[PDB]
Write a protein that binds this ligand. Structure first.
Ligand SMILES: *[C@@H]1O[C@H](CO)[C@@H](O[C@H]2O[C@H](CO)[C@@H](O)[C@H](O)[C@H]2NC(C)=O)[C@H](O)[C@H]1NC(C)=O
Ligand code: NAG
Lengths: 258, 393, 393
C-alpha cells in the first residue's frame, strides 16, 4: 500500500555493511494457535486496584467463569463471535457487583486491542437516573436483583469472522535509481507467509542483497548488503502489506555512499 | 561280593539295547537298557547384559539476554551444546525479553531403561560342560531307574546293585565358548566384550549386572538445532541395538543345533544330544544269582513262526514249545546281532509253549535263540511293511 | 534411623518438623525441603510423610499439575501449544501394550481429589476438569484403552504408523496431538496371529500391569518456568499498568524508573508503553514434569524432585495358536506334507546328523512340500506344534 509513515536517509562507506532497519512486530508469524488463542475476550472488576478477572471467552465455544460462585449468573452470548455481541448480562445484581467493569479484547493474529470501561452502581431502590455520560465511561444504575445489560459490541470483520486460518502476509522490497518517478521502480525481494524468497535482481546482485535469515518471526526485515557499490545508491522502499488487518504500510530509505 | 559287567551303548535316547549277563556256573540273563535323558550342563560365567536404552533429556536452559556455557559431566554419552539466535515461543508470548543474545543450552545422556529388569539379554562365557544322565534297566523283570554323573566317578547303590556310568565318549557341546541367552532361548555369538559395543549393534549399552549403577554405552548421540520459536531438544541417535536384535536374531539352538539336541534355559542345558556312546558298569550283587542246579533247564524245545515282517519294530511273532525242568523264571536271549528279541524273560513250567517277538531287516531270517540254558533254531520268511517312513528310532 | 537434611540440621526422613500436613502449611518451603533431599535414600519416605494430610491420605497430585507443551501435528497439519502434548511413548511390552505419557493428568480434578470420570488439563493459567469418557487414542483405528492414571495411558493400538491422543475440554472444542510412531508389535512364538485362539499354547511375554500401584518406576519434576502471558499489560493512556490476578508477576520494562520488579499487587510504570515491557507469572508452589518441551526456570539452579509412576512392566503369559495338523504322506526316504495355514506360519526342519542343514520358511498359503528323510533323522517344527520326528525304515 501507500501509507508512508517515516522516511530515513543513510550514508555508509564503499564496501561496508549496509543495513536498512525495516522492523515491525505487527507482522510476527510463527505457527497457528489453531483459532483457539487467536482472539480472546475478558472482563475485569474493581472494588476498589486490585482488578479481578471475572470470565474470559475464546473464539471456539462457551465461556469460563474464574469464580465458581458467579457461575450461571453471568451470561455472554454463547454465539457472540458469529455476530459480534460481547455484552454481559447480570441476571441477579447483588451489591458486591458494584464497581468498574472493563471489556478487553485481544487479536493475537494481528496484535490489536480495543477496550471500553463501564461503571455499575447498585441502587437499593428503583432506578436512580441510570444511563448517562456518553463522552466518557458509561455508568448504569441497577436495582437489587434486577438484570443489567453491559454493552460491548464490535462489528468489524477483524473480530466476527470464523474465517481464514491464521496466515497470509506479504513484504516487498523495491528499488529506485536516482530520478525515477517510482511508477516503474525495480523489484528486488519478496517475502511471503509460508516463505517464498523471490529474488528478482540480476544474478551477481542477489549475492549481497539478502534479507536476514529467519526474519519473519522477530519482525525485523532489515535488508543487508555486504559490499556497497557506488551505483547502488538510491531510494529503496520497504513495501509492507497485510490485508484483512490494515497494514498498508511502507517505509522509505535514502542510501548514499561516499 | 558280586560281579561287574561292562557294556557300551550308543548315546541315543529311546533305543532298547540288550546285553547278555554271563556269570560262570549261573543261568544267563537278558538285561534291557533304555537311556531316558542325558543332561549337558555347562559351567557359565556372566560378562554383561544388554537392554533397551533410555535417552534422558532434562528441560533445556534457555538463558535470556545472556550466553550459557556447557560443562562436560561424567554421564554415559553426555551430550551438551549451546545454541545462539533463538526466540522461544510459549503460548503466552516470548520467554526471552531481549531480541538478541538469546541462548539455549541442551543436555542429554543415556542410561538403562526402566524395562531393563524384564526385557534383557544375558551374555555368558560357557566352558567345560558337565554331564548327567538317566537310564532305565530291566533287571529282575523290574523297570528300575538310575540317575548319576555320566563320567564314571560316582556310583549309584540301587538295591545292592552298584551302577557306574561314564565317561562320555564325546566332549561335545553345541554351546560355543561365548553365548547369549534371552529368557527362553540360547544363541551362539561372539558378543562384543565389555567396553566395545558399537551403535546399532548388539549391546549399544552394556552393564555387568542389571543393578550396577554405572553402565557403558555409546549410541552416537548428537543434538540437532531446535526449530525457530520452539522449545524442544531434537537429537540424532542410533536406535536400540536390543530391539534391532530382537527382530534380527533368527532361530535359537533349539531349532538349529546338530545331533537333535534339546536346548533349555535356567539352567542353560542341552538334553538328549545323540553324540558318541556311553559305557555302563553294573555290579550285580551275588545274592540274586542262582546256580544251574536250582535253575530250570529246558529240554527238547521247538520253534515255529506263523508270520513275520521285516521292519524297525518287532514285526515277527514266534512260539516255542519246551519241556522245562520245573516251575520258575527264565531268560530269552538272541545270540546274533542282526536279529533282536523284544522279550528277555518268560516263565517256564514243565511242558508248555511261550509267545515272543523278534525284529530284523532281511526277508529270510535264520538265527538261534537260547532259553535260559539251551539253544534252538528259528527260521522263517518276513514280508515288507506298509511304511517307508517311521517316526521312532 | 534414616536421616534427612534441611539446610543445617538432621532429622528422621519419615518425621519432618512441619508435621502434620506439611504442604498445606507452607507450600514453597515444603517443596524446597523435598528438592534438597532428592539424592538421599529416605527421600521417598519424606515424600510419603510430607504430602499426606489426614484429619492413607497421601495424594502426590496435590503438588503436580498439567501443562501446555509443543505438539507438531495438532490436526490440520500446523503445530500448536497443546494441553494434550506427548512426552514419550513406550513399546517395551512384548504383547504390544503402549505406555503413553501426556501433559494432562487423568483421574485428578482441579481440587486434587481422585475421580476416574474426570481429568485436568491446563487452560492458559488455570487447570480445568474435563470428561474422561471423551478421551481417545488412535493410530489408524481407535485403540482400546486399558488404563489411565496421572500422565500415563495404557492402550492396545492396532498396526499403524502414526498415533493420535486427544480429548474434549470444557467448552466442547476438541484438542488432539499426533506424532509419528511405527507401531507393529513383535510376533510371539512362531505364528503371526491377531486374536488369542481357543486351544493354543502358553508362551512368555511382557505386558504393562493395569494396576495404579506406584512401586518402582519414577519421573523427575521441578518448579515451572516464569510463565509469560501478554494479557497482563494494560495501557493507562500514557503508561503501563499490570494486574496480578491472584498470582505474583515478574515484570521488565524498557524505560526509566523501576523498570523491573516482582510485584504481588497491581503496579504501574510511568513514562512507558506496552511494547517496551514484558511480564510473566511466577509460581513456586507447584511441580511439573522435567520436559524437553518446557524450558527450565532460570533463577533457581538444578533443583529437582522425583515421584513414582503407575503401570510397571511385568512378565506374564500370552497364548498363541497351534497350527492345524498337516496332511502327511510317505515315500522312500521322503515325507510329503501338505500345509494348510490360516495365517503366516513358520516351518523349520533339521536333520539329526552333524550337518543339520536347518531350513526355515514363512509358509503363507497352502503348499505341498517334500522333505528328504535321511537315516540320521529329521525333526520338523511346524508353527508352535511340538516337533515332529521322522526316520527311514
Ligand atoms: C518296562 O518299560 C517299558 C517302557 O515303558 C514298558 O513298555 C511296554 O509296555 C506297553 C504295554 O502294552 C507296550 O505297548 C509298549 O510298546 C512297551 N513300550 C516299550 C517302550 O517297550 C514295559 O511294559 C515295562 N515292563 C516292565 C516289566 O516293567
Ligand atoms: C520376570 O521379571 C522379573 C523382574 O520383574 C525378573 O527378575 C525375572 O528374571 C523375569 N523372568 C523371566 C523368565 O523373564
Amino acid at each position: 500500500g501507500s501509507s508512508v509513515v517515516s522516511e530515513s536517509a543513510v550514508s555508509w562507506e564503499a564496501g561496508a555493511r549496509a543495513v536498512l532497519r525495516c522492523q515491525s512486530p505487527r507482522m510476527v508469524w510463527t505457527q497457528d494457535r489453531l483459532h483457539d488463542r487467536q482472539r480472546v475476550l475478558h472482563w475485569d472488576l474493581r472494588g476498589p486496584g486490585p482488578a479481578r478477572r471475572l470470565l474470559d471467552l475464546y473464539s471456539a465455544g462457551e465461556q469460563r467463569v474464574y469464580e465458581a460462585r458467579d457461575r450461571g449468573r453471568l451470561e455472554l452470548s454463547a454465539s457472540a463471535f458469529d455476530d459480534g455481541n460481547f455484552s454481559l448480562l447480570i441476571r441477579a445484581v447483588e451489591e458486591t457487583d458494584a464497581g468498574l467493569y472493563t471489556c478487553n479484547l485481544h487479536h493475537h493474529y494481528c496484535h490489536l486491542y480495543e477496550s471500553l470501561a463501564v461503571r455499575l452502581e447498585v441502587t437499593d431502590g428503583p432506578p436512580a437516573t441510570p444511563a448517562y455520560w456518553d463522552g466518557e465511561k458509561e455508568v448504569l444504575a441497577v436495582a437489587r436483583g434486577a438484570p443489567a445489560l453491559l454493552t460491548c459490541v464490535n462489528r468489524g470483520h477483524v473480530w466476527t469472522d470464523r474465517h481464514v486460518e491464521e496466515a497470509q502476509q506479504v513484504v516487498h522490497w523495491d528499488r529506485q535509481p536516482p530520478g525515477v518517478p517510482h511508477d516503474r521502480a525495480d523489484r528486488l525481494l519478496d517475502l511471503y507467509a509460508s516463505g517464498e524468497r523471490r529474488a528478482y535482481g540480476p544474478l551477481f546482485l542477489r549475492d549481497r542483497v539478502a534479507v536476514g535469515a529467519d526474519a519473519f518471526e522477530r519482525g525485523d526485515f532489515s535488508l543487508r548488503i555486504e559490499p556497497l557499490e557506488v551505483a547502488d545508491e538510491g531510494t529503496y522502499s520497504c513495501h509492507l502489506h497485510h490485508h484483512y488487518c490494515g497494514l498498508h504500510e511502507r517505509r522509505v530509505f535514502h542510501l548514499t555512499v561516499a | 561280593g558280586s560281579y561287574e559287567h561292562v557294556t557300551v551303548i550308543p548315546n541315543t535316547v529311546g533305543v532298547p539295547y540288550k546285553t547278555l549277563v554271563n556269570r560262570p556256573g549261573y543261568s544267563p540273563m537278558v538285561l534291557e537298557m533304555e537311556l531316558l535323558s542325558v543332561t549337558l550342563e555347562p559351567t557359565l560365567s556372566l560378562d554383561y547384559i544388554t537392554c533397551e536404552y533410555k535417552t534422558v533429556i532434562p528441560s533445556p536452559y534457555v538463558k535470556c539476554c545472556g550466553t550459557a556455557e556447557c560443562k562436560d559431566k561424567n554421564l554415559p554419552d553426555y551430550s551438551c551444546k549451546v545454541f545462539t539466535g533463538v526466540y522461544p515461543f510459549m503460548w503466552g508470548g516470548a520467554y526471552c525479553f531481549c531480541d538478541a543474545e538469546n541462548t539455549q543450552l541442551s543436555e542429554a545422556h543415556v542410561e538403562k531403561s526402566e524395562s531393563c529388569k524384564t526385557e534383557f539379554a544375558s551374555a555368558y562365557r560357557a566352558h567345560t560342560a558337565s554331564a548327567s544322565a538317566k537310564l532305565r534297566v530291566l533287571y529282575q523283570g523290574n523297570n528300575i531307574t538310575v540317575t548319576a554323573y555320566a563320567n564314571g566317578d560316582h556310583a549309584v547303590t540301587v538295591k545292592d546293585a552298584k551302577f557306574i556310568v561314564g565317561p562320555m565318549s564325546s566332549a561335545w557341546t553345541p554351546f560355543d565358548n561365548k553365548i547369549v541367552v534371552y529368557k527362553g532361548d540360547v544363541y551362539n555369538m561372539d558378543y562384543p566384550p565389555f567396553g566395545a559395543g558399537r551403535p546399532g549393534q548388539f549391546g549399544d549399552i552394556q552393564s555387568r549386572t542389571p543393578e550396577s549403577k554405572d553402565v557403558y554405552a555409546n549410541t552416537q548421540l548428537v543434538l540437532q538445532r531446535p526449530a525457530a520459536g520452539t522449545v524442544h531438544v531434537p537429537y540424532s541417535q542410533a536406535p536400540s541395538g536390543f530391539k534391532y536384535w530382537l527382530k534380527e536374531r533368527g532361530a535359537s539352538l533349539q531349532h538349529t543345533a546338530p545331533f537333535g539336541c534339546q536346548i533349555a534355559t535356567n539352567p542353560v542345558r542341552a538334553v538328549n544330544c545323540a553324540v558318541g556312546n556311553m559305557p555302563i558298569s553294573i555290579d550285580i550283587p551275588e545274592a540274586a544269582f542262582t546256580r544251574v542246579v536250582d535253575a530250570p533247564s529246558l529240554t527238547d524245545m521247538s520253534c515255529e513262526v506263523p508270520a513275520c515282517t521285516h521292519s524297525s519294530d518287532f514285526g515277527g511273532v514266534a512260539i516255542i514249545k519246551y519241556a522245562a525242568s520245573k516251575k520258575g523264571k527264565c531268560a530269552v536271549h538272541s545270540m546274533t546281532n542282526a536279529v533282536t528279541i523284544r522279550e528277555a524273560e518268560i516263565e517256564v513250567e514243565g511242558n508248555s509253549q511261550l509267545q515272543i517277538s523278534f525284529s530284523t531287516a532281511l526277508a529270510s531270517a535264520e538265527f538261534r535263540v537260547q532259553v535260559c540254558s539251551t539253544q534252538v533254531h528259528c527260521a522263517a520268511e518276513c514280508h515288507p511293511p506298509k511304511d517307508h517312513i517311521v517316526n521312532y528310532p | 534411623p534414616v536421616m534427612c537434611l534441611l539446610a543445617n540440621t538432621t532429622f528422621p526422613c519419615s518425621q519432618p518438623p512441619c508435621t502434620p500436613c506439611c504442604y498445606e502449611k507452607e507450600p514453597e518451603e515444603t517443596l524446597r525441603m523435598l528438592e534438597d533431599n532428592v539424592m538421599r535414600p529416605g527421600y521417598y519416605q519424606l515424600l510419603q510423610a510430607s504430602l499426606t494430610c489426614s484429619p492413607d491420605n497421601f495424594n502426590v497430585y496435590k503438588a503436580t499439575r498439567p501443562y501446555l507443551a509443543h505438539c507438531p501435528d495438532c490436526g490440520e497439519g500446523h503445530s500448536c501449544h497443546s494441553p494434550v502434548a506427548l512426552e514419550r511413548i513406550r513399546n517395551e511390552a512384548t504383547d504390544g501394550t503402549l505406555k503413553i505419557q501426556v501433559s494432562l493428568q487423568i483421574g485428578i480434578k482441579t481440587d486434587d481429589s481422585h475421580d476416574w470420570t474426570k481429568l485436568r488439563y491446563m487452560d492458559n493459567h488455570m487447570p480445568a476438569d474435563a470428561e474422561r469418557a471423551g478421551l481417545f487414542v488412535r493410530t489408524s483405528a481407535p485403540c482400546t484403552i486399558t488404563g489411565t492414571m496421572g500422565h500415563f495411558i495404557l492402550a492396545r493400538c492396532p498396526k499403524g504408523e502414526t498415533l493420535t491422543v486427544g480429548f474434549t475440554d470444557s467448552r466442547k472444542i476438541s484438542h488432539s496431538c499426533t506424532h509419528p510412531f511405527h507401531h507393529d508389535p513383535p510376533v510371539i512364538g512362531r505364528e503371526k496371529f491377531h486374536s488369542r485362539p481357543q486351544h493354543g499354547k502358553e508362551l512368555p511375554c511382557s505386558t504393562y500391569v493395569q494396576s495404579t500401584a506406584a512401586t518402582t518406576e519414577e519421573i523427575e519434576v521441578h518448579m515451572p518456568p516464569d510463565t509469560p502471558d501478554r494479557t497482563l499489560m494494560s495501557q493507562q493512556s500514557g503508561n503501563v499498568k499490570i494486574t496480578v490476578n491472584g498470582q505474583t508477576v515478574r515484570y521488565k520494562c524498557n524505560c526509566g524508573g523501576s523498570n523491573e520488579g516482582l510485584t504481588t499487587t497491581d503496579k504501574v510504570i510511568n513514562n512507558c508503553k506496552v511494547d517496551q515491557c514484558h511480564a510473566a507469572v511466577t509460581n513456586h508452589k507447584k511441580w511439573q514434569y522435567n520436559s524437553p518441551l518446557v524450558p527450565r526456570n532460570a533463577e533457581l539452579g538444578d533443583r529437582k524432585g522425583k515421584i513414582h509412576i503407575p503401570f510397571p512392566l511385568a512378565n506374564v503369559t500370552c497364548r498363541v495358536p497351534k497350527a492345524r495338523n498337516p496332511t502327511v504322506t510317505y515315500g522312500k526316504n521322503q515325507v510329503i506334507m501338505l500345509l494348510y495355514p490360516d495365517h503366516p506360519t513358520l516351518l523349520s526342519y533339521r536333520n539329526m546328523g552333524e550337518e543339520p542343514n536347518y531350513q526355515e520358511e514363512w509358509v503363507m498359503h497352502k503348499k505341498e512340500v517334500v522333505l528328504t528323510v535321511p537315516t540320521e533323522g529329521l525333526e520338523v517344527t511346524w508353527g508352535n506344534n511340538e516337533p515332529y520326528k521322522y526316520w527311514p525304515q
